[model samples]
Target: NPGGIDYVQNYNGDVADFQYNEGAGTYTCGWDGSTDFVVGLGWSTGAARDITYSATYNAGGSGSYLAVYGWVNSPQAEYYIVESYGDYNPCSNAEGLGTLESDGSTYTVCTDTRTNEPSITGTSTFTQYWSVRQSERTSGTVTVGNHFNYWAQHGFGDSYNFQVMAVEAFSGSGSASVSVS
Candidate 1:
């Protein structure tokens, strides 16, 4: 299904199912049993360094996550948010490096290296960073502007090319209701 507001419903992997309710502004993303994801919507904003992403959820779902997906020219790579549920890995291979405080919340920071480097939508390698909530959140705000600045100051070379809010299901059923501004 297609979505509006500069976002689209997209999926990867086999057996992944999703329902995009454009009129309702909701998406039901689920997986039967596989490594797959359903992107609720993806928005492309070139060189957005000072944008805020605020979202709210019902807090009842498996593998539900909100991500910032983007590409950079320097390395010509793809990177995105990572939200793990048990043993499921979403975007890239990551290891917990440390903690970071951003937008008035503490997040477990992880780093990802893409040496093989997928097609850049320019370089031999690139790195991705994920600052995930330590626990699930019912509702809150995320200031991506602060995050981008923090990462840049800390030496992670990444710029906002696209943003996504999605829910993934590694096993069993997964669904959530989300609102973003």
Candidate 2:
């Protein structure tokens, strides 16, 4: 909502089961089954910062992961957006899927000084599109009041059901759950 504040948000979850076979000759095989949770999201506002943009879910207790991923949109708006993102190892240790656009395209951004540290004069009208993959994401309009926060206790966005994805080899020995408390 460019009127006040605007942002996009999402919530997702799934169940994954993997079994390995070890018999006489010592052969190992793995399999991933269905019941895999998947969700899609789309939000638009003239004011931008009013919509809370994020994604979250729980895996009922699959410990350690090798990969987690999701899709992203690409639109020509006056702001940034996320295309796709996730975690791959120790999957529980996730990171923000970076930022992209509303049109769902792909662009490369440097995590170093080029992006993390922009020059005061480098700012543009800000329409960006994102690609779909196993990476973290964020997007949309911005204003002085455009700020983001979630569970400060664990970590912002960690509890918001908006910006967390279990991208990895979920620990075969543990479990994960999600709720709003």
Candidate 3:
């Protein structure tokens, strides 16, 4: 109810929910028995920006993650700055490109290719860049340009588009309440 619609990047589930209060500038996200889902407050711009937020989270016994998820152009890539997760770590086995220090934490930078997978444009191929923090936290600031610079050092693009302080769940019931600015 704030302004932008709930951003659903990719989903294959049955039930999903986003509850928000425009007055308080906070929102809640949850899902039930989902194959997988990614949804959250959407942000879109062509310029670089930063994110700061707090969250109360619960992902009971399966796979789920909390992160800043988004895309960039001029090489079109999907990116994540993962703060926390449940049972599954999305980049646990992926090859690490490098690491960087940001927000008083170390992040493992990794990239992968998704051939003909879902994307902002359509079912097209794209690279997925990640900056997974070594530790988990429920609240912190994310200077997105820190990642843009990291990726650029590793040969990834910097054009910004859509992003969200997002919660993703995989075949499980989970919920999160978020405060962002």
Candidate 4:
């Protein structure tokens, strides 16, 4: 190919532009207060008996209520239904961890009476359910209204769309406070 290109003149149309950069291992859908076009960041699987959720007595205080939802995965099926919900910090001890009961096909919510000093509390609780299909192709999105647990009640659907989330921080130390906003 020879460089004999001619210059253009009298252009009135807007120039279409795009950006391409390659450095990271993966690109997460950045949060911007909207769920439209949102894709699931990750997936979790298992016979999830209880989906933990929490309610706040005080926004900055302790000793709030916690709720757990149970998912009933079928035995004939190869995968379990998985659900995700907002809950307080999980206890360090297994006994302290929440409890969920499963009878192969159905799961039931049970009270985790074991208590520990509360570390964090929020204004409210949120729990989204996702059915764990044996296959990976059927995993659901974490988008609002399109949660994972939505299809469970739709007559024991073979595959269910469930929410997916990954909560993590940069460091082990929790949030530090500052006077300024």
Name the top TM-score candidate.
3
Error of 3 at 20 (Å): 2.2
- What are the clashing pairs of model 3? none
Residue lDDT tens for model 4, 1-181: 0111111111111111111112211112122111112111112232222222111111122211111112223311112133221122332221211233232222222112213322112222222232321221112221222222333343233332222222212111111111100
List, residue by residue over 29-129, the lDDT tens digit for candidate 3: 77767466776665665335667778998887758888988888768888889998888777777768879999989998898888999777888888888
Ranking by TM-score: 3, 1, 2, 4
Candidate rank order under lDDT = 3, 1, 2, 4
lDDT tens digits, residues 109-173, model 1? Answer: 66667675434433356677666765545445555655565556546555445565565554555
Which regions of candidate 4 fall more than 4 Å away from where they truly are?
1-27, 41-83, 86-154, 157-181
TM-score of each: 0.67, 0.20, 0.87, 0.19
TM-score of 4: 0.19
Candidate 2's C-alpha runs over 4 A off are 1-37, 40-47, 50-56, 60-181
Per-model C-alpha lDDT, please?
Answer: 0.52, 0.24, 0.76, 0.21
Whichever of 1 and 3 has more lDDT, that candidate is 3
State, as a TM-score between 0 and 1, how close model 1 is to the true structure.
0.67
Per-model root-mean-square deviation over C-alphas: 4.8, 16.7, 2.9, 18.9
By lDDT, who's the top model here?
3
